[PDB]
Coordinates of C-alpha atoms in Angstrom, one line a residue:
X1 CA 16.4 2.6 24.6
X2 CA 16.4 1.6 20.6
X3 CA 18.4 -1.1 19.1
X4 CA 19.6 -0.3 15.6
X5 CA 20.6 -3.5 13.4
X6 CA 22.2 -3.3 10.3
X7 CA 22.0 -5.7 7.8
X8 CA 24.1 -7.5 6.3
X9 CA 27.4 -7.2 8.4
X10 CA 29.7 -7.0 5.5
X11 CA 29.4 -6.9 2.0
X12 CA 32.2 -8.5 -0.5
X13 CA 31.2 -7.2 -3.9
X14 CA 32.8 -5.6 -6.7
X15 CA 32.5 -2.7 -8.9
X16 CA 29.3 -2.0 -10.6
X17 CA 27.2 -4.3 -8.4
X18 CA 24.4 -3.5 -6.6
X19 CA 24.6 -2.9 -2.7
X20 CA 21.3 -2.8 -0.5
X21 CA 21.6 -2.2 3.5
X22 CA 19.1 -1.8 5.4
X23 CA 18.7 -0.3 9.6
X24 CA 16.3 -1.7 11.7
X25 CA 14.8 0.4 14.4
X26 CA 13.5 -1.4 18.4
X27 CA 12.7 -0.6 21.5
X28 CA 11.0 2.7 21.6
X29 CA 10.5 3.1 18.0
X30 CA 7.7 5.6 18.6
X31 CA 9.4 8.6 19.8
X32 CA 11.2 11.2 17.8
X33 CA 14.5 10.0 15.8
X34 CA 16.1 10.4 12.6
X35 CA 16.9 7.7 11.0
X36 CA 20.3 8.5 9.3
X37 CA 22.5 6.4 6.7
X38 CA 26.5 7.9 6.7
X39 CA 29.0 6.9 4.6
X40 CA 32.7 7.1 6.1
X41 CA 35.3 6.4 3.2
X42 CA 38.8 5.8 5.8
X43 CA 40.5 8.1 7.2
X44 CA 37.3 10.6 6.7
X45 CA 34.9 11.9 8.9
X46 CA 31.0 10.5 8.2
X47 CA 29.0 11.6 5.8
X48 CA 25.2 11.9 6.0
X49 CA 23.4 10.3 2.9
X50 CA 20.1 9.8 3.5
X51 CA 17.8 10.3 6.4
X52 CA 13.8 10.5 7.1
X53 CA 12.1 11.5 10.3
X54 CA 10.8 8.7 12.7
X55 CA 7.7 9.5 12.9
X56 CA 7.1 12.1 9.9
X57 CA 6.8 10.4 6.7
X58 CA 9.5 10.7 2.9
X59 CA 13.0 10.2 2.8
X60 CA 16.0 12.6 2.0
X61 CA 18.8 12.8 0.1
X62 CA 21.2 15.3 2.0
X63 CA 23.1 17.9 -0.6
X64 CA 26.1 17.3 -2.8
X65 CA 25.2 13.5 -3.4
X66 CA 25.0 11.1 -6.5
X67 CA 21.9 9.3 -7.8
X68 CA 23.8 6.1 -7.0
X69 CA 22.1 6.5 -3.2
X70 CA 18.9 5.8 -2.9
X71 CA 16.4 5.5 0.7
X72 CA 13.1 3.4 0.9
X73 CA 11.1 2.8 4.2
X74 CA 9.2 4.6 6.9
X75 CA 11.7 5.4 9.6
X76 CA 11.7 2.4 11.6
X77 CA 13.4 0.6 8.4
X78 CA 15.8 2.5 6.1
X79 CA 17.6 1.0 3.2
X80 CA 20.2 2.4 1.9
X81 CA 20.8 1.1 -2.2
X82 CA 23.7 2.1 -3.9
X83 CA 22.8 0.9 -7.4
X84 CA 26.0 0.0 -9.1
X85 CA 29.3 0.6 -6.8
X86 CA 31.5 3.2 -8.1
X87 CA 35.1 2.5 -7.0
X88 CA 35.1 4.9 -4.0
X89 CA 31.9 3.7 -2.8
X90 CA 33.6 1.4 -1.2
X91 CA 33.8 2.3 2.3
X92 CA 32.0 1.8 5.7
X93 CA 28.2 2.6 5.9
X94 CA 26.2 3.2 9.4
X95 CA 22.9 4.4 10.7
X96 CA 22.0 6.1 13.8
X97 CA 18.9 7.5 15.2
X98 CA 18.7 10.4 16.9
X99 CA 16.6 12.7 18.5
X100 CA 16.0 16.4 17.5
X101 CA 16.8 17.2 21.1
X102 CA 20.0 14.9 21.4
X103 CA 18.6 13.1 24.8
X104 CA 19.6 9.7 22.6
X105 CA 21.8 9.0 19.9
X106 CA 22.2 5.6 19.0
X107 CA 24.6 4.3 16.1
X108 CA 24.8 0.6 14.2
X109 CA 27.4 -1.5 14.7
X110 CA 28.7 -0.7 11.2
X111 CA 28.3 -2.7 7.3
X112 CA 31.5 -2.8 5.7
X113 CA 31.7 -2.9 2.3
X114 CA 34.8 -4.1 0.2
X115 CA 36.0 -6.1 -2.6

């Protein structure tokens, strides 16, 4: 198994501050994943944001997204910076792992981020 943990839990900020979350990978953290961040604004279906492969080495941004999103790690820790909130961006944020072959998919337990 891997354990995903997210960090922080929540996030009370306010527009045009700075929000950094991060995903730390456990357990078998030498296999295969992707290490995805989603954004899911309510009543939406997730969106994928960033993501870098486990064990391959540079981030991604996926199409169709601001500069406000930003990944920095290796693959057992993304973070996920969104520089200066835009209204919108306010929304639930998660990270999953999983592998090209879909034997395991793991998610966080979710960062909420608000006002």
């Amino acid at each position: 198994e891997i354990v995903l943990t997210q960090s922080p839990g929540t996030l009370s900020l306010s527009p045009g501050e700075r929000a950094t979350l991060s995903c730390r990978a456990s357990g078998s953290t030498f296999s295969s994943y992707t290490l995805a961040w989603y954004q899911q604004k309510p009543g939406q279906a997730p969106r994928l944001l960033i993501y870098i492969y486990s064990d391959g080495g540079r981030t991604s941004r996926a199409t169709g997204i601001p500069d406000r999103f930003s990944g920095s790690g290796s693959g057992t820790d993304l973070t996920l910076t969104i520089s200066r909130l835009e209204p919108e961006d306010f929304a639930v944020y998660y990270c999953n792992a999983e592998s090209p072959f879909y034997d395991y998919d793991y998610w966080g337990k979710g960062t909420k981020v608000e006002i």
